Ligand binder design. Structure first.
Ligand SMILES: CC(C)(CC(=O)O)CC(=O)Nc1cc(Cl)cc(Cl)c1
Length: 133
């Protein structure tokens, strides 16, 4: 019942500073523009200890499955090859990605009827708000 309140199908309803976050990460111009236009759905499910998060949009469909606290390799939507670990910290899903000596952290939180995603790369934070589909 670890992630019950995250499970479901969510649709992006607002974004702030995502282009700048992507710039800070190192994403190139064309990918930033097309990815920034996307209105993804985020589909979260749990089966036993395995959490699956899918992101689907006109730009890209991605899928990760993982066990909390157990590192895995991830190819991101912008084609980084990263080492990822996702944990629960005080009811927040905390996703750390490591590559090329860099690090970014993505937090997913339930707030009211929304799922709020905060993406941090060095001093740059982007906030993406999802609602139930
Ligand atoms: C958690 C997430 C960050 C944001 C969301 O799910 O809303 C997933 C995502 O879109 N990743 C991403 C995509 C591109 Cl193309 C470039 C970079 Cl840096 C990141």
């Amino acid at each position: 019942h670890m992630c019950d309140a995250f499970v479901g199908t969510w649709k992006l309803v607002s974004s702030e500073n995502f282009d700048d976050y992507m710039k800070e990460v190192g994403v190139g111009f064309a990918t930033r523009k097309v990815a920034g236009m996307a209105k993804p759905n985020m589909i979260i499910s749990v089966n036993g200890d395995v959490i699956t998060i899918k992101s689907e949009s006109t730009f890209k469909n991605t899928e990760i499955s993982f066990i909390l606290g157990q590192e895995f390799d991830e190819v991101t939507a912008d084609d980084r090859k990263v080492k990822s670990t996702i944990t629960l910290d005080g009811g927040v899903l905390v996703h750390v990605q490591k590559w090329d000596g860099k690090s970014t952290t993505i937090k997913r939180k339930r707030e009211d009827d929304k799922l709020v995603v905060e993406c941090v790369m060095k001093g740059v934070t982007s906030t993406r708000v999802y609602e139930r589909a």
